[PDB]
Enzyme design. Structure first.
Site, PDB file in Angstrom:
ATOM      1  N   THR A  44      16.971  -4.175  93.555  1.00 32.13           N
ATOM      2  CA  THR A  44      16.842  -2.750  92.906  1.00 32.13           C
ATOM      3  C   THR A  44      16.429  -3.147  91.459  1.00 32.13           C
ATOM      4  O   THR A  44      15.177  -2.516  91.170  1.00 32.13           O
ATOM      5  CB  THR A  44      18.089  -2.020  92.806  1.00 32.13           C
ATOM      6  N   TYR A 107      18.558   6.833 102.384  1.00 35.42           N
ATOM      7  CA  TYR A 107      17.823   8.088 102.990  1.00 35.42           C
ATOM      8  C   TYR A 107      18.180   8.670 104.206  1.00 35.42           C
ATOM      9  O   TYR A 107      18.624   9.567 104.565  1.00 35.42           O
ATOM     10  CB  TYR A 107      16.245   7.880 102.526  1.00 35.42           C
ATOM     11  N   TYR A 133      25.811  -4.577 100.336  1.00 32.50           N
ATOM     12  CA  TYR A 133      25.633  -3.940  98.756  1.00 32.50           C
ATOM     13  C   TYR A 133      25.731  -2.301  99.273  1.00 32.50           C
ATOM     14  O   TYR A 133      25.039  -1.789  99.542  1.00 32.50           O
ATOM     15  CB  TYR A 133      24.229  -4.397  98.485  1.00 32.50           C
ATOM     16  N   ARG A 138      22.872   6.115  94.991  1.00 36.17           N
ATOM     17  CA  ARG A 138      21.459   5.985  95.324  1.00 36.17           C
ATOM     18  C   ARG A 138      21.188   6.082  96.750  1.00 36.17           C
ATOM     19  O   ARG A 138      19.717   6.576  96.930  1.00 36.17           O
ATOM     20  CB  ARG A 138      21.140   4.552  94.772  1.00 36.17           C
ATOM     21  N   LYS A 161      28.502  -6.469  97.437  1.00 33.48           N
ATOM     22  CA  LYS A 161      28.322  -6.188  95.967  1.00 33.48           C
ATOM     23  C   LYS A 161      28.876  -4.625  96.100  1.00 33.48           C
ATOM     24  O   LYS A 161      28.149  -3.564  96.434  1.00 33.48           O
ATOM     25  CB  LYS A 161      26.683  -5.861  95.946  1.00 33.48           C
ATOM     26  N   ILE A 203      26.994  -9.056  89.739  1.00 37.42           N
ATOM     27  CA  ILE A 203      25.542  -9.003  89.935  1.00 37.42           C
ATOM     28  C   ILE A 203      24.899  -7.911  89.077  1.00 37.42           C
ATOM     29  O   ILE A 203      24.837  -6.964  89.409  1.00 37.42           O
ATOM     30  CB  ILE A 203      25.166  -8.771  91.523  1.00 37.42           C
TER      31      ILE A 203
END
Lengths: 291, 291
Positions: A44, A107, A133, A138, A161, A203
């Protein structure tokens, strides 16, 4: 199993948006010299979604090249489609990547069983270590701790993550996993807390500007020296907060630019950090002793 | 201009996940017969995310061909990368779509000024009617009323699918813009209210199983018949709720199967509607006399 400070390296760009290969070359070099333990290529923070698929591979390739087997390299290969995720992971494997980080589909909001079937499919299709992750804010989806535990059974799902920044929940995650897969903080503000609790590393976005500090913070925190961990982290604590005044990687990219390490390039829909913030940042950078 | 019940059409699929062309074709014809005002090809409901670009185009073109100019066709061409949204849109124009529906960049969380620059860049790069599409739950961003007002100034940004489901906020938006740009509802259960307050249509999911019922509901609410609208919508109100028991289009695609209109193909990360909602959905489709 990868441990420590894993930087989510930005992707340097020239004023006109093209990838700055030299800054990147030097950035990778700098990290290894500084103590950085691993690098996530095109995640990202690396502007994965605005890079040509080819750019994707070239960046992974260049980083692995410069890295020269000195530290592990993780490539971001998550996608909201399963066909597409396998494709990108297969490639990472073929380019010599040590492992792959795959964000939960975004999404399209798959179900929990969807997230399960999604990673199960990718684990079976590609023989490369996979790091899950989760980042609900987001993606529009939250991979429950339960689903994670299920996926932890799979031989090549090695970690997750957790970028929720909800430490108690991370405590429960680490406890439920019984070690079946590593846990990485995906939230710089709390990372040291998660490692004191058992997480294997951070991370980190901050590691982009304070690789050495984040490297000791990770070492000590992993070692469970809560005293030295809190102390070392207070020093860069404000950084963890200010690097998100605007969506990541907008601020860190500028931070780096103010450190004379990279240019102003960043691709739309992402924009250069807004004026108002440019000064407070320069201040935060000065206080932290990076400028 | 484009008004009424706009179906966000599913993309039929064979058991093996391939696009089921013949079933689609029959669907489009059917929608025209039953009274649908226009069609969104390859939207969230059309599984945009899991269809290669080549399939994106193929699907947009079969639909344009079979419609054969009888109702306008809107191609879903949103993307989270600006340069790549420009490509998808160019293609939609070149393929003869009457307009393009573009969701706000998802996952990468652009700023408001970014959403502005993003959309402005696409509008100037392609001369085709563009419709915004705000849906925070999936995208991670929230195009603000202010920002949408700013973009209405652009001649070819002609509308906005508002999926917030926030009626107060939607009405404020409608008032703020003069008929400066259209406002389409993106929440089937509130749509009738939104249209009554000024909206010009409903980019609908429920329209996939109750095409004529929704035609009527939209026509009446746009006519501002508060009372006919409230009763015409009750006859299908449950449908609106139950079709989201699991992430769209998972439920609507199964409803369509239980109506013997489509097969069960659906792509990972998405999965067939879970066993436990099938009878409740069969019961829902009978209650509204769909079968």
């Amino acid at each position: 199993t990868i441990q420590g400070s894993i930087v989510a390296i930005v992707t340097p760009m020239l004023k006109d948006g093209g990838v700055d290969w030299k800054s990147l070359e030097k950035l990778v070099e700098w990290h290894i010299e500084q103590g950085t333990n691993s690098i996530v290529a095109v995640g990202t923070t690396g502007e994965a979604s605005t890079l040509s698929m080819e750019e994707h591979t070239q960046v992974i390739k260049e980083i692995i090249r410069v890295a020269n087997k000195r530290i592990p390299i993780i490539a971001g290969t998550g996608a909201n489609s399963t066909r597409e995720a396998i494709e990108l992971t297969k490639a990472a494997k073929d380019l010599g990547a040590d492992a792959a980080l795959l964000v939960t589909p975004y999404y399209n909001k798959p179900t929990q069983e969807g997230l399960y079937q999604h990673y199960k499919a990718i684990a079976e299709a590609v023989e490369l270590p996979l790091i899950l992750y989760n980042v609900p804010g987001r993606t529009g989806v939250d991979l429950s701790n339960d689903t994670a535990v299920r996926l932890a059974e799979i031989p090549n799902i090695v970690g997750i993550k957790d970028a929720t920044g909800d430490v108690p929940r991370g405590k429960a995650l680490i406890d439920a996993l019984n070690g079946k897969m590593a846990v990485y903080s995906g939230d710089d503000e709390t990372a040291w807390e998660l490692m004191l609790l058992g997480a294997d590393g951070n991370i980190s976005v901050t590691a982009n500007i304070a690789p050495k500090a984040m490297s000791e913070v990770c070492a000590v925190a992993i070692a469970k020296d809560e005293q030295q961990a809190k102390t070392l982290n207070n020093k860069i604590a404000n950084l963890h907060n200010i690097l998100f005044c605007e969506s990541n990687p907008i601020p860190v990219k500028w931070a780096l630019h103010e450190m004379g390490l990279i240019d102003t390039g960043i691709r739309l829909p992402l924009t250069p950090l807004a004026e108002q913030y440019r000064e407070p940042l320069r201040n935060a950078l000065k206080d932290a002793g990076i400028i």
